[PDB]
Write a protein that binds this ligand. Structure first.
Ligand SMILES: Nc1ncnc2c1ncn2[C@@H]1O[C@H](COP(=O)(O)OP(=O)(O)O)[C@@H](O)[C@H]1O
Lengths: 370, 269, 57, 188
């Protein structure tokens, strides 16, 4: 069909949607469904029990927040289907799903049953012409314009590192860990409660995320800043009330390098990057250390690169060149790559048509998916 | 015979890790002149002895051995008995038994059973020692395994500043057997050796045992992760390299589409 | 076809054993953390060992 | 929160206790007359006897349905409007957070404490709620000591009597030397 393919980046934090060829995602909204907790008494009050995107952000206080996706895995499908209906609605893209093909960008090492169930939605519920699922890491390098390189994509839901050689992703060298941005936000809330600031409500947890995003830096030396008495840095809440954040600024983000803080038996983000390179063949290890690409929202912490670069050099072999490159638009890397892939004529052969799905079934996605 | 010693050590690396005791004995009988070098150089499974004085099972090292007799760290006695009196100090006996108590709780938390023995000897600069940890899999349980670890530590105590230099060498030897009906009888052996050097602050709040304790568990964690991820991963990759379940004809179809993409990417420049 | 099925199940079972060993046998010999899911506090153990022996008796 | 939550029902029934001195009578009424219904809706639908309570002055108040409707807050925080989990969810959720090896022991060893556990039928209501939230085929053994209120103090008496207690506490001299650090070092 002549119609441009729609790129849908189903992220845990924010979903990035737009047409192939577009330089930036036109339609980016938070990935959760807000339902009103308060009772409607007056006539002429706000209509609907479902609010998505800017309508939910404006009247957030009325709503109870519930994210359908956890660690990049759709927990509630009923809500996820309604969000994709919102992606096509008059507020977002405003187009028929039957007219435009779809390009999905999922995390690596996900269950097969999820892709199978996701495919059912776009072929049965939506009569989509063709669906192709692609890796986030491979597209991230396509956006950067590099064929060989390591993509350390620390998202809100999941953190993974994929070493990719001349476009190809080595499936044995992929390392994936559940600990991500949302776990640091939970850890900050726990530490602020010990300081004596309570944020019990799901709406108030969004303020805790806003506090982290605005005022949170990663210390170069953790034990130095941990021991030293910290300046009580005040933050102004939406209502007007002032809270002293103080040491919680740098102690919260440490979770990424020390997973035992929350109590998870996993490797640190700096260990994941180095191990992923070391698993690769001797010839490529020096090039993978030379070409390191940062991605994901959880790398946006102040002084993240300085701390990570120090840890990589300590874990990495002696006399190895460690060059870590950060694109300014870290968040948009996955989507931009998808737009580039979708614009190619080779993409027509790559995706699975509706007719092909009906004949073979789930097999058609597994055969043609990379 | 220096060339035979190299050949003997190089062979032991390739021979099965369970047959090291029998295979080492044969090499010693062929070249008995290098018996001391082969016994010292080649890593051997840890022997266990029962101390009838305290009533505790202790692991045997090279440091506690005075001639033929081995010293038990709990009793501070040589078996068979000796009147040499090689105990370096009374303060060492207090620190050594306290150290054993510290790593006795450690093994009960992490390993849950087994044996741990801490042997300290005094030196002119600062005390050194070895920490032996051994954990055996349950016989009745289908799963069979054997953990061996040797942590050699040398502490160089500074005159002023109280910032001793901690030199740790760790040699781990792991046996694994999985008797799952699906696979058959899988046996995956391995051995790793690493070294670490740090300069921790010594005090009443931060004593020697606390400074060493953190360094010992930190090395075991790095080795545990590296073995399970890097070495056990590479092993799986080679097995999948030998045979494929998917036909190559079907693989070449996907490779042709991937190759066509790569050409279309290099094309559009 | 009998060879194909038997060798496919054998290779599949070896792949399953790698995941199984990480979760069972390998962790069973040495845990990543104690049952409390915390790192050992060596300063607390030196004083606590005495306190816990009398408090748990 | 149950005493304040009961006060809301007494005012709606037509019994006012505005004063801080009067709230202590509502607290005494709450402790005297409150039952945890095994089936909430069943007892809501049935017409109560409206049991009378004698106030200090001599006046009688008819508590009625407010008796069992007030203490429900512990199991349903939605009633006061706080977006928290119920007390029965706290117990099960806290065990499910722990490692697989202990969960079975933790379900086997459950100890009830605190003053708000003294409500009649707390054990039978909690046990039923735990069954709904708990995993299938798990044995649940909830142990409630007769001296629930004094369990924390009696513990302190035992701990203090142990010789180890001499090493555990912080001396006045140690506090003067290290300061706030002293109590943080020998506590944590
Ligand atoms: N400036 C910032 N500093 C620190 N963390 C940030 C910042 N901006 C966003 N984040 C974190 O990153 C998350 C966004 O992750 P995102 O890039 O949307 O992941 P995904 O790959 O799942 O789409 C936010 O929810 C927040 O936790």
């Amino acid at each position: 069909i002549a119609n441009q393919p729609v790129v849908i980046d189903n992220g845990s934090g924010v979903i990035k949607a737009g047409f192939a060829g577009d330089q930036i995602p036109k339609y980016c909204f938070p990935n959760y469904v807000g339902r009103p907790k308060h009772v409607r008494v007056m006539a002429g009050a706000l209509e609907g029990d479902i609010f998505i995107g800017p309508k939910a952000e404006e009247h957030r206080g009325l709503l109870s927040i519930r994210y359908p996706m956890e660690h990049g895995i759709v927990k509630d499908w009923n809500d996820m289907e309604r969000i994709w209906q919102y992606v096509y609605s008059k507020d977002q893209l405003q187009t028929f799903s039957e007219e435009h093909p779809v390009l999905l960008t999922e995390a690596p090492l996900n269950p097969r049953k999820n892709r199978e169930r996701a495919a059912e939605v776009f072929f049965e519920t939506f009569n989509v012409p063709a669906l192709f699922i692609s890796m986030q890491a491979v597209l991230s390098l396509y956006a950067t314009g590099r064929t060989t390189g390591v993509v350390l994509d620390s998202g809100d839901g999941v953190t993974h590192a994929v070493p990719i050689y001349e476009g190809f992703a080595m499936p044995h060298s992929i390392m994936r860990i559940d600990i991500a941005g949302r776990d640091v936000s939970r850890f900050l809330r726990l530490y602020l409660r010990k300081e004596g600031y309570d944020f019990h409500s799901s709406s108030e947890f969004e303020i805790v995320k806003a506090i982290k995003e605005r005022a949170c830096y990663l210390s170069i030396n953790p034990q130095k800043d941990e021991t030293l008495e910290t300046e009580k840095a005040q933050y102004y809440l939406p209502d007007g009330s002032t809270i002293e954040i103080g040491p919680s600024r740098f102690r919260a983000p440490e979770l990424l390098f020390r997973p035992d803080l929350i109590g998870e038996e996993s490797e640190g983000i700096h260990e994941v990057l180095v191990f992923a390179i070391q698993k690769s063949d001797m010839d490529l290890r020096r090039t993978l250390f030379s070409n390191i690409v940062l991605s994901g929202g959880s790398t946006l912490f102040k002084g993240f690169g300085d701390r990570l670069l120090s840890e990589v050099k300590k874990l990495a072999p002696k006399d190895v060149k460690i060059r870590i490159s950060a694109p300014q638009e870290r968040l948009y890397s996955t989507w931009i790559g998808g737009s580039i892939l979708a614009s190619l004529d080779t993409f027509k052969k790559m995706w699975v048509s509706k007719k092909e799905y009906e004949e073979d079934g789930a097999r058609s996605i597994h055969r043609k998916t990379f | 015979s220096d060339q035979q010693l190299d050949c003997a050590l190089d062979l032991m690396r390739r021979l099965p890790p369970q047959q090291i005791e029998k295979n080492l004995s044969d090499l010693i009988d062929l070249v008995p002149s290098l018996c001391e070098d082969l016994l010292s150089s080649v890593d051997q499974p840890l022997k266990i002895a029962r101390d009838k004085v305290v009533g505790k099972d202790y692991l045997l090292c090279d440091y506690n051995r005075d001639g033929d007799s081995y010293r038990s760290p709990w009793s501070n006695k040589y078996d068979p008995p000796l009147e040499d009196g090689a105990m370096p100090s009374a303060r060492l006996r207090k620190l050594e038994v306290e150290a054993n108590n510290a790593f006795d709780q450690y093994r009960d938390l992490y390993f849950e059973g087994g044996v741990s023995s801490v042997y300290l000897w005094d030196l002119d600069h600062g005390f050194a020692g070895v920490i032996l940890i051994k954990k055996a899999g349950d016989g009745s349980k289908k799963i069979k395994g054997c953990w061996d670890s040797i942590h050699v530590v040398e502490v160089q105590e500074k005159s002023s500043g109280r910032t001793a230099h901690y030199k740790l060498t760790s040699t781990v030897m792991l046996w694994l057997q999985t008797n799952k009906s699906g696979s058959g009888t899988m046996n995956l052996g391995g051995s790793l050796t690493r070294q670490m050097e740090k300069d921790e602050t010594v005090s009443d709040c931060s004593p020697h045992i606390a400074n060493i304790g953190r360094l010992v568990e930190d090395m075991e964690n790095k080795i545990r992760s590296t073995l399970n991820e890097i070495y056990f991963g590479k092993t799986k990759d080679i097995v999948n390299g030998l045979r494929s379940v998917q036909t190559f004809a079907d693989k070449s179809k996907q490779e042709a589409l991937k190759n066509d993409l790569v050409e279309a990417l290099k094309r559009k420049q | 076809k009998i060879i194909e099925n038997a060798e496919n199940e054998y290779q599949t079972a070896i792949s399953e054993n790698y995941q199984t060993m990480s979760d069972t046998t390998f962790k069973a010999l040495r845990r990543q953390l104690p049952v409390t899911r915390t790192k050992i506090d060596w300063n607390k153990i030196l004083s606590y060992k005495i306190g816990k022996e009398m408090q748990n008796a």
